[PDB]
Design an enzyme around this catalytic site. Structure first.
Site, PDB file in Angstrom:
ATOM      1  N   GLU A 120      -3.480  13.494   1.254  1.00 26.46           N
ATOM      2  CA  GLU A 120      -5.116  13.061   2.530  1.00 26.46           C
ATOM      3  C   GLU A 120      -5.331  14.016   3.128  1.00 26.46           C
ATOM      4  O   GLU A 120      -6.807  14.433   2.661  1.00 26.46           O
ATOM      5  CB  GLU A 120      -4.145  11.566   3.371  1.00 26.46           C
ATOM      6  CG  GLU A 120      -3.828  10.924   2.468  1.00 26.46           C
ATOM      7  CD  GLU A 120      -4.756   9.582   3.760  1.00 26.46           C
ATOM      8  OE1 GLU A 120      -3.707   9.524   4.574  1.00 26.46           O
ATOM      9  OE2 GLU A 120      -4.422   8.517   2.484  1.00 26.46           O
ATOM     10  N   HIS A 167       1.615   9.000   1.528  1.00 26.72           N
ATOM     11  CA  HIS A 167       1.015   9.278   0.840  1.00 26.72           C
ATOM     12  C   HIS A 167       1.362   9.478  -0.517  1.00 26.72           C
ATOM     13  O   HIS A 167       1.454  11.134   0.431  1.00 26.72           O
ATOM     14  CB  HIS A 167      -1.034   8.804   1.376  1.00 26.72           C
ATOM     15  CG  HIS A 167      -0.925   8.794   2.531  1.00 26.72           C
ATOM     16  ND1 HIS A 167      -2.173   7.596   2.386  1.00 26.72           N
ATOM     17  CD2 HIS A 167      -0.654   8.521   3.745  1.00 26.72           C
ATOM     18  CE1 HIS A 167      -1.720   6.765   3.662  1.00 26.72           C
ATOM     19  NE2 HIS A 167      -1.262   7.437   4.819  1.00 26.72           N
ATOM     20  N   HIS A 223       3.210  10.584   7.386  1.00 27.39           N
ATOM     21  CA  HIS A 223       2.359  10.466   8.778  1.00 27.39           C
ATOM     22  C   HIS A 223       3.809   9.669   9.784  1.00 27.39           C
ATOM     23  O   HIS A 223       4.227   8.780   9.636  1.00 27.39           O
ATOM     24  CB  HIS A 223       0.956   9.459   8.619  1.00 27.39           C
ATOM     25  CG  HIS A 223       0.104  10.462   7.903  1.00 27.39           C
ATOM     26  ND1 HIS A 223      -0.842   9.224   7.356  1.00 27.39           N
ATOM     27  CD2 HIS A 223      -0.088  11.707   7.694  1.00 27.39           C
ATOM     28  CE1 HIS A 223      -1.610  10.545   6.945  1.00 27.39           C
ATOM     29  NE2 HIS A 223      -1.192  11.581   6.543  1.00 27.39           N
ATOM     30  N   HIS A 274       0.871  -1.399  -0.169  1.00 22.43           N
ATOM     31  CA  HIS A 274       0.401   0.072   0.125  1.00 22.43           C
ATOM     32  C   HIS A 274       0.815   0.920  -0.219  1.00 22.43           C
ATOM     33  O   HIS A 274       0.692   2.448  -0.656  1.00 22.43           O
ATOM     34  CB  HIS A 274      -0.983   0.023   0.864  1.00 22.43           C
ATOM     35  CG  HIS A 274      -2.080  -1.407   1.446  1.00 22.43           C
ATOM     36  ND1 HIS A 274      -3.052  -1.897   0.228  1.00 22.43           N
ATOM     37  CD2 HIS A 274      -1.851  -2.125   2.240  1.00 22.43           C
ATOM     38  CE1 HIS A 274      -3.454  -2.478   1.204  1.00 22.43           C
ATOM     39  NE2 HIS A 274      -2.726  -3.218   1.492  1.00 22.43           N
ATOM     40  N   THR A 329      -6.487   6.136   8.512  1.00 24.76           N
ATOM     41  CA  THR A 329      -6.845   6.353   6.871  1.00 24.76           C
ATOM     42  C   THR A 329      -6.946   5.623   6.204  1.00 24.76           C
ATOM     43  O   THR A 329      -6.906   5.270   5.464  1.00 24.76           O
ATOM     44  CB  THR A 329      -6.241   7.475   6.486  1.00 24.76           C
ATOM     45  OG1 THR A 329      -4.752   6.933   5.799  1.00 24.76           O
ATOM     46  CG2 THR A 329      -6.329   8.574   7.616  1.00 24.76           C
ATOM     47  N   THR A 330      -6.210   3.910   6.323  1.00 32.70           N
ATOM     48  CA  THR A 330      -6.981   2.727   6.113  1.00 32.70           C
ATOM     49  C   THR A 330      -7.302   1.577   7.138  1.00 32.70           C
ATOM     50  O   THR A 330      -7.479   1.816   7.960  1.00 32.70           O
ATOM     51  CB  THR A 330      -5.458   1.956   5.599  1.00 32.70           C
ATOM     52  OG1 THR A 330      -4.484   1.724   6.527  1.00 32.70           O
ATOM     53  CG2 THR A 330      -4.456   2.894   4.843  1.00 32.70           C
ATOM     54  N   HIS A 345       5.629   6.515   7.352  1.00 32.10           N
ATOM     55  CA  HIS A 345       5.440   6.521   5.880  1.00 32.10           C
ATOM     56  C   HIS A 345       4.675   7.372   5.494  1.00 32.10           C
ATOM     57  O   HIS A 345       4.698   8.162   6.020  1.00 32.10           O
ATOM     58  CB  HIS A 345       4.045   5.242   6.118  1.00 32.10           C
ATOM     59  CG  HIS A 345       2.494   5.758   6.113  1.00 32.10           C
ATOM     60  ND1 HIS A 345       2.379   5.617   7.406  1.00 32.10           N
ATOM     61  CD2 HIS A 345       1.879   6.262   5.837  1.00 32.10           C
ATOM     62  CE1 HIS A 345       1.378   6.182   8.373  1.00 32.10           C
ATOM     63  NE2 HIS A 345       0.707   6.212   7.144  1.00 32.10           N
TER      64      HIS A 345
HETATM   65  C1  LIG Z   1       0.580  -0.296  12.687  1.00 28.12           C
HETATM   66  C2  LIG Z   1      -1.348  -0.137  11.714  1.00 28.12           C
HETATM   67  C3  LIG Z   1      -1.842  -0.434  12.222  1.00 28.12           C
HETATM   68  C4  LIG Z   1      -3.237  -0.392  12.511  1.00 28.12           C
HETATM   69  O1  LIG Z   1      -4.107  -1.192  12.433  1.00 28.12           O
HETATM   70  O2  LIG Z   1      -3.328   0.018  10.586  1.00 28.12           O
HETATM   71  C5  LIG Z   1      -2.590   0.810  10.378  1.00 28.12           C
HETATM   72  C6  LIG Z   1      -2.897   2.086   9.853  1.00 28.12           C
HETATM   73  C7  LIG Z   1      -1.682   2.923   9.645  1.00 28.12           C
HETATM   74  C8  LIG Z   1      -2.063   4.173   8.114  1.00 28.12           C
HETATM   75  S1  LIG Z   1      -2.584   5.461   9.260  1.00 28.12           S
HETATM   76  N1  LIG Z   1      -2.429   6.630   7.571  1.00 28.12           N
HETATM   77  O3  LIG Z   1      -3.508   5.146   9.395  1.00 28.12           O
HETATM   78  O4  LIG Z   1      -1.152   6.282   9.814  1.00 28.12           O
HETATM   79  C9  LIG Z   1      -0.617   3.042   9.749  1.00 28.12           C
HETATM   80  C10 LIG Z   1       0.123   1.895  10.731  1.00 28.12           C
HETATM   81  C11 LIG Z   1      -1.555   1.445  11.230  1.00 28.12           C
HETATM   82 ZN   LIG Z   2      -1.130   7.282   5.997  1.00 25.93          ZN
END
Ligand SMILES: Cc1cc(=O)oc2cc(CS(N)(=O)=O)ccc12
Ligand SMILES: [Zn+2]
Length: 261
Positions: A107, A97, A120, A65, A199-200, A95
């Site tokens: 985002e 986006h 992020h 992703h 956000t995912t 990470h």
């Molecule tokens: C470590 C972890 C566990 C989880 O269930 O979901 C995640 C979602 C994000 C993406 S964001 N864009 O929401 O930071 C980053 C890290 C995780």
């Molecule tokens: Zn993110």
């Protein structure tokens, strides 16, 4: 997650997520558009405290992703505190986006403006013991968001750009020690903050969002490298890793607060 099939394509993208993750249509989803004229200055917000001098990065991973730069969070080294937060939040990974073109990729948006990318830095509340327990709490995570625009190169980001060749496809990882995240921060720490979510998927509503007002500049060459990564695994048809961002969600009953006037 061994049966997750969500992604960012036409058939499994953000508009499809609610089917397997109903919370996608919840009351505090992220990202959101930040209306600069409606966000209110909150004189009670404490100064933000980003203490990354002792951060210990360990590895970088292409998870199909995005790519995650992971840190050793078995101890209180790199922490985020202050600002709108109560307590200590430990940095676990960062990470990005980004888009297929410079006109999109972030985002969060600012007065509907989309930046070329968004960084992020994810932190979890140490009062919950581990990240898994923290995501089940409304104040379990604090994600620091930083916008990227294309212009001059960001010296501090090049070490990340150069290692991407080694993790082109989903599932590949590479040792990535001694990377200093302080090199990804803008000069000012002025920010907007609001209660939101991951956000995912699983899209859990466990995040206090802190989005910096000042974007950092990265070069066209640096972002072009991001766009050469693959969503697919090795030996599979190439699907370039681009546009891995979720669009702005309904603000609903929330207020975005500003740390600055
Ligand atoms: C470590 C972890 C566990 C989880 O269930 O979901 C995640 C979602 C994000 C993406 S964001 N864009 O929401 O930071 C980053 C890290 C995780
Ligand atoms: Zn993110």
């Amino acid at each position: 997650g061994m049966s997750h099939h969500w992604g960012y394509g036409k058939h499994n993208g953000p508009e499809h997520w609610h089917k397997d993750f109903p919370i996608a249509k919840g009351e505090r989803q992220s990202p959101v558009d930040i209306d600069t004229h409606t966000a209110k200055y909150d004189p009670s917000l404490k100064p933000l405290s980003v203490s990354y001098d002792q951060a210990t990065s360990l590895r970088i991973l292409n998870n199909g992703h995005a790519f995650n730069v992971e840190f050793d969070d078995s101890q209180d080294k790199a922490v985020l505190k202050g600002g709108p937060l109560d307590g200590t939040y430990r940095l676990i990974q960062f990470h990005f986006h980004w888009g297929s073109l410079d006109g999109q990729g972030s985002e969060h948006t600012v007065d509907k403006k989309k930046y070329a990318a968004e960084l992020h830095l994810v932190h979890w509340n140490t009062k919950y013991g581990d990240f898994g327990k923290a995501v089940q709490q409304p104040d379990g995570l604090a994600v620091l968001g930083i916008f990227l625009k294309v212009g001059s190169a960001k010296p501090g980001l090049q070490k990340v750009v150069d290692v991407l060749d080694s993790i082109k496809t989903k599932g590949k990882s590479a040792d990535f020690t001694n990377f200093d995240p302080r090199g990804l921060l803008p000069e000012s720490l002025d920010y907007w903050t609001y209660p939101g979510s991951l956000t995912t998927p699983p899209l859990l509503e466990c995040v206090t969002w802190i989005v910096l007002k000042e974007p950092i500049s990265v070069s066209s060459e640096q972002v072009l490298k991001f766009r050469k990564l693959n969503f697919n695994g090795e030996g599979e048809p190439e699907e370039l890793m681009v546009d891995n961002w979720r669009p702005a969600q309904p603000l609903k009953n929330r207020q975005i607060k500003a740390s600055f006037k």
